[PDB]
Design an enzyme around this catalytic site. Structure first.
Site, PDB file in Angstrom:
ATOM      1  N   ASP A  46      41.686  29.655  59.762  1.00 51.75           N
ATOM      2  CA  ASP A  46      42.162  30.968  59.387  1.00 51.75           C
ATOM      3  C   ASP A  46      41.464  31.524  58.162  1.00 51.75           C
ATOM      4  O   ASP A  46      41.660  31.033  57.056  1.00 51.75           O
ATOM      5  CB  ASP A  46      43.673  30.957  59.192  1.00 51.75           C
ATOM      6  CG  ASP A  46      44.293  32.324  59.407  1.00 51.75           C
ATOM      7  OD1 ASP A  46      45.202  32.443  60.244  1.00 51.75           O
ATOM      8  OD2 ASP A  46      43.871  33.294  58.757  1.00 51.75           O
ATOM      9  N   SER A  97      45.911  38.602  60.458  1.00 57.28           N
ATOM     10  CA  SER A  97      45.934  37.428  61.325  1.00 57.28           C
ATOM     11  C   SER A  97      46.532  37.687  62.699  1.00 57.28           C
ATOM     12  O   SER A  97      46.090  37.111  63.688  1.00 57.28           O
ATOM     13  CB  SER A  97      46.699  36.301  60.634  1.00 57.28           C
ATOM     14  OG  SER A  97      46.067  35.929  59.400  1.00 57.28           O
ATOM     15  N   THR A 150      48.991  33.263  63.870  1.00 60.54           N
ATOM     16  CA  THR A 150      48.052  32.539  64.737  1.00 60.54           C
ATOM     17  C   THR A 150      48.689  31.710  65.868  1.00 60.54           C
ATOM     18  O   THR A 150      48.242  31.792  67.026  1.00 60.54           O
ATOM     19  CB  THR A 150      47.113  31.645  63.885  1.00 60.54           C
ATOM     20  OG1 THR A 150      46.668  32.366  62.722  1.00 60.54           O
ATOM     21  CG2 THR A 150      45.905  31.178  64.708  1.00 60.54           C
ATOM     22  N   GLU A 317      44.911  25.108  64.522  1.00 59.96           N
ATOM     23  CA  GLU A 317      44.666  25.992  63.396  1.00 59.96           C
ATOM     24  C   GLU A 317      44.747  25.368  62.011  1.00 59.96           C
ATOM     25  O   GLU A 317      45.722  24.696  61.671  1.00 59.96           O
ATOM     26  CB  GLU A 317      45.625  27.178  63.427  1.00 59.96           C
ATOM     27  CG  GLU A 317      45.258  28.215  62.409  1.00 59.96           C
ATOM     28  CD  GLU A 317      46.437  28.992  61.909  1.00 59.96           C
ATOM     29  OE1 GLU A 317      46.187  29.986  61.222  1.00 59.96           O
ATOM     30  OE2 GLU A 317      47.604  28.622  62.174  1.00 59.96           O
ATOM     31  N   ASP A 322      42.929  30.417  54.781  1.00 60.79           N
ATOM     32  CA  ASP A 322      43.282  31.800  54.512  1.00 60.79           C
ATOM     33  C   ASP A 322      44.238  31.856  53.331  1.00 60.79           C
ATOM     34  O   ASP A 322      44.024  32.595  52.378  1.00 60.79           O
ATOM     35  CB  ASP A 322      43.986  32.380  55.744  1.00 60.79           C
ATOM     36  CG  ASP A 322      44.471  33.806  55.532  1.00 60.79           C
ATOM     37  OD1 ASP A 322      43.638  34.736  55.562  1.00 60.79           O
ATOM     38  OD2 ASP A 322      45.696  33.997  55.351  1.00 60.79           O
ATOM     39  N   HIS A 326      43.705  33.619  49.615  1.00 56.14           N
ATOM     40  CA  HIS A 326      44.534  34.718  49.087  1.00 56.14           C
ATOM     41  C   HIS A 326      44.923  34.354  47.675  1.00 56.14           C
ATOM     42  O   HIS A 326      44.899  35.181  46.775  1.00 56.14           O
ATOM     43  CB  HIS A 326      45.844  34.895  49.887  1.00 56.14           C
ATOM     44  CG  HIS A 326      45.689  35.659  51.165  1.00 56.14           C
ATOM     45  ND1 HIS A 326      45.269  36.966  51.235  1.00 56.14           N
ATOM     46  CD2 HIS A 326      45.879  35.272  52.451  1.00 56.14           C
ATOM     47  CE1 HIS A 326      45.203  37.322  52.531  1.00 56.14           C
ATOM     48  NE2 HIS A 326      45.564  36.329  53.327  1.00 56.14           N
ATOM     49  N   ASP A 364      39.555  33.828  62.517  1.00 52.77           N
ATOM     50  CA  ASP A 364      40.104  35.083  62.986  1.00 52.77           C
ATOM     51  C   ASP A 364      39.505  36.299  62.267  1.00 52.77           C
ATOM     52  O   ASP A 364      39.437  37.382  62.837  1.00 52.77           O
ATOM     53  CB  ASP A 364      41.628  35.066  62.897  1.00 52.77           C
ATOM     54  CG  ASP A 364      42.132  34.691  61.537  1.00 52.77           C
ATOM     55  OD1 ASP A 364      41.330  34.226  60.685  1.00 52.77           O
ATOM     56  OD2 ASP A 364      43.347  34.848  61.324  1.00 52.77           O
ATOM     57  N   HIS A 365      39.057  36.113  61.025  1.00 53.20           N
ATOM     58  CA  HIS A 365      38.449  37.184  60.217  1.00 53.20           C
ATOM     59  C   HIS A 365      37.798  36.559  58.970  1.00 53.20           C
ATOM     60  O   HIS A 365      37.986  35.377  58.717  1.00 53.20           O
ATOM     61  CB  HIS A 365      39.514  38.220  59.794  1.00 53.20           C
ATOM     62  CG  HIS A 365      40.702  37.610  59.132  1.00 53.20           C
ATOM     63  ND1 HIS A 365      40.714  37.163  57.833  1.00 53.20           N
ATOM     64  CD2 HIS A 365      41.891  37.232  59.658  1.00 53.20           C
ATOM     65  CE1 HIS A 365      41.857  36.521  57.621  1.00 53.20           C
ATOM     66  NE2 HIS A 365      42.616  36.530  58.705  1.00 53.20           N
ATOM     67  N   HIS A 407      41.440  40.034  52.939  1.00 55.03           N
ATOM     68  CA  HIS A 407      40.551  39.745  54.054  1.00 55.03           C
ATOM     69  C   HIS A 407      39.362  40.675  53.924  1.00 55.03           C
ATOM     70  O   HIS A 407      39.423  41.648  53.160  1.00 55.03           O
ATOM     71  CB  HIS A 407      41.234  40.080  55.382  1.00 55.03           C
ATOM     72  CG  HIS A 407      42.435  39.248  55.686  1.00 55.03           C
ATOM     73  ND1 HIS A 407      43.196  39.391  56.824  1.00 55.03           N
ATOM     74  CD2 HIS A 407      43.030  38.262  54.971  1.00 55.03           C
ATOM     75  CE1 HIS A 407      44.209  38.516  56.766  1.00 55.03           C
ATOM     76  NE2 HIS A 407      44.156  37.797  55.659  1.00 55.03           N
TER      77      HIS A 407
HETATM   78 MG   LIG Z   1      47.431  31.854  60.695  1.00 53.08          MG
HETATM   79 ZN   LIG Z   2      44.048  35.272  59.459  1.00 53.25          ZN
HETATM   80 ZN   LIG Z   3      45.486  36.315  55.383  1.00 54.59          ZN
END
Ligand SMILES: [Mg+2]
Ligand SMILES: [Zn+2]
Ligand SMILES: [Zn+2]
Ligand SMILES: [Mg+2]
Ligand SMILES: [Zn+2]
Ligand SMILES: [Zn+2]
Lengths: 444, 444
Positions: A46, A97, A150, A317, A322, A326, A364-365, A407
């Protein structure tokens, strides 16, 4: 299609930094197969863009090193993951997400925050539902709350990713509210989906009681047990599970919320690469040997799932890459990328022995972290780290004046190994993945 | 291995955002050739990482759009470009333009600022020098000063990229300084290298007079002429050139410094996406119609160079993508990415038609620009843009408080088309590019 991509030798000498040992043409040509896949394992880091992969390799394996899991998939490309503006249906360049996961699981774009529903709030079946219908075994593992975007995207069709259980759904997704004649909250939809193996955190939402339906009055955990789910809460009980099927599906809840991160490191600070000493990550003392590791969950899932003759579909995952991104925490972020690499190795090891498994690793990004020079005087948060090469690497998070870094919308790496893996080469869209997985498995 | 990678239809509908029309396996398999390449065209977008490619595409073609040049190369991968710290010999995670260019044109890692010399300050032959020795025609084109790190790396062996002409060399590169045994400044070595086609800016340094040797006393411009170079300074005279070879080498100097950028837009500002309205880039009113575009120069070069029966090696550089990224100017940056795409198209067209040409498009390193949410409150410089979608895209530069945004160390995209293009797939190193090209031409 080489398996070793580490530097050849002395990186200061001619050809010592090369990762290739020869011509790939023949090898690469040999790995191109259109034969159907019997199994699929999709590993999602992620928020793990090329920057995140580079930073963690540099730290854990050294600049000229290579991840035996993450860097070993032979076929590579880049893909787009832009979302849609709910009102205008115009592209929203930076996806969340939820919308991104919905895209590869259903094959249709959507707006930020939606799970399994299109711009019209119309439901579309996910790849896990279709697989389960073809008779394939299905797994869903993650280090986050099982209600997180996710994993939730594979089993729930809800209008706001915040509709975790009955409480949030009644007031945030009234139309999905079980009482209002809806399909229910994410948790309830997860219980209905009934994947053979589901492992992760988010045990707390299971303490909520259903407001309507057959199991009204009972907590979601009680409903789980009443419906035949085997429940496990630690590495030990997970280890003892010998069977997972429709008669007795497995459900592991290893944390109230998200499972703990592996490494501990301080949060990046303003002028941290100048005013604070370089850090060396250490293991997180808050994590117990009872909380399973991603590699352990992946390993167990594969063993239980591989018993199905028709095949299986599994998504794994590494959620907190992610999350720590953050939080502007390099150690936490890097530890989780390493944690995912171990999981990819387990998957690749199975894929290679079996010979009919398509393994895909992507994100995912993209996210906030950037690798910058040691002497950078940056406006955001930075931190210097002591890498494996015995050199300092500075990381920077400079896209948010808030408590949470954000993101980013850069296209990113998607890699695959196995049958139909060639469809990941070049520029593709996140929605193509859905169709790639559906065609490899021969789904209708 | 398809050519059209745009979204298929309505991005709001199932499958409307797909870029794949079908299964790539057969197509990809067919595009894998190990036959020797007769020609090589290397297009470099200075500082053009995946984020840069995505922002420009979002803006110029829309999220679901696709660059007819940049996004049309079928074989893709990611590569590393870390440099070496001069003292320790250990990795320096964020390379500069000089060290990176030296790696692909020489095959050996080096420290930041070095041009064509390893960490031991020792010279190594460049792929242009090797090509020219095998009898191939050579070309070097760029939109920056011809003394800039990227074009210079192919013709100069100097300890500091700042050694432009005789003056700076005497003072900063005394050992390369002509007036004491060295091969001379960047300009003097470029003049000695004598590639068939050399087009770009940096006419300012040719105004310097040599301090020793045969042409001591004459401006470097005068020496060029004394040596047989055809000197062209505008589009009309460039277009008039009929031939370029070792008897009559082409030297085009279209600007004093770097060539002017294509588009104009304001500089990103602090909270620029919030305090100021979105911007729409416009053509640069100062750019004189007499200055050639990267595509025109690329086109002319291919034309002159393809006349050699043996083949040619051509390097093209969209140099200001980087410069505008440093300056935090989205419109300047995107305009130059668009500019490079046109050059790529010209390259791909010749390649497809000739059928034995290897085309590679990549970047020397990643940069600062990030695509963030429209409501982002960033600590650095932001700006909102009106994209082709009629949607707002925000860009952020937040890795420096100095007046120059910095390079970043993330691995980035490398894409290719033609014989030997499969060697660009998977994870590789920037130095592998040297060997891939050397092998493609059989230039051992
Ligand atoms: Mg996730
Ligand atoms: Zn994500
Ligand atoms: Zn995020
Ligand atoms: Mg350059
Ligand atoms: Zn550069
Ligand atoms: Zn630069």
């Amino acid at each position: 299609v080489l398996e070793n991509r580490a530097a050849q030798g002395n990186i200061t000498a001619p050809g010592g930094a090369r990762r290739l040992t020869g011509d790939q043409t023949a090898a690469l040509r040999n790995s191109l197969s259109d034969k159907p896949a019997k199994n699929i394992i999709l590993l999602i880091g992620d928020g793990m863009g090329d920057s995140e992969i580079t930073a963690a390799r540099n730290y854990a394996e050294g600049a000229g090193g290579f991840f035996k899991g993450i860097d070993a998939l032979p076929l590579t490309g880049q893909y787009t993951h832009y979302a849609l503006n709910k009102k205008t249906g115009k592209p929203d360049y930076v996806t969340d997400s939820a919308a991104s996961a919905t895209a590869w699981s259903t094959g249709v774009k959507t707006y930020n925050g939606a799970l399994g529903v299109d711009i019209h709030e119309k439901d579309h079946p996910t790849i896990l539902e279709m697989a389960k219908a073809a008779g394939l075994a299905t797994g869903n593992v993650s280090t986050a709350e099982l209600q997180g975007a996710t994993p939730a995207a594979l089993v729930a069709h809800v209008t706001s990713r915040k509709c975790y259980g009955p409480s949030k759904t009644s007031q945030k997704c009234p139309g999905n509210a079980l009482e209002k004649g809806g399909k229910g909250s994410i948790t309830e939809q997860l219980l209905n989906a009934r994947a053979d193996v589901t492992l992760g955190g988010g045990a707390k939402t299971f303490a909520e009681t259903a407001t309507a339906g057959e199991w009204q009055g009972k907590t979601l955990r009680e409903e789980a047990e009443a419906r035949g789910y085997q429940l496990v809460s630690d590495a030990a009980s997970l280890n003892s599970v010998t069977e997972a099927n429709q008669q007795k599906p497995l459900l592991g809840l290893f944390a109230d919320g998200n499972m703990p991160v592996r490494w501990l490191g301080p949060k990046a600070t303003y002028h941290g690469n100048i005013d604070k000493p370089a850090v060396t990550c250490t293991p997180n003392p808050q994590r117990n040997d009872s909380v399973p590791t991603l590699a352990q969950m992946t390993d167990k899932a594969i063993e239980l799932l591989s018993k199905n003759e028709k095949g299986f579909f599994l998504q794994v995952e590494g959620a907190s890459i992610d999350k720590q991104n953050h939080a502007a925490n390099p150690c936490g972020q890097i530890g989780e990328t390493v944690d995912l690499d171990e999981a990819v190795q387990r998957a690749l090891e199975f894929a290679k022995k079996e010979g009919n498994t398509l393994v895909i690793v992507t994100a995912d990004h993209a996210h906030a972290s950037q690798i910058v020079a040691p002497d950078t005087k940056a406006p955001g948060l930075t931190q210097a780290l002591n890498t494996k090469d015995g050199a300092v690497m500075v990381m920077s998070y400079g896209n948010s004046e808030e408590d949470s870094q954000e993101h980013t919308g850069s296209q990113l790496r998607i890699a695959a190994y196995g049958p139909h893996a060639a469809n990941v080469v070049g520029l593709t869209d996140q929605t193509d993945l859905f169709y790639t997985m559906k065609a490899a498995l021969g789904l209708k």
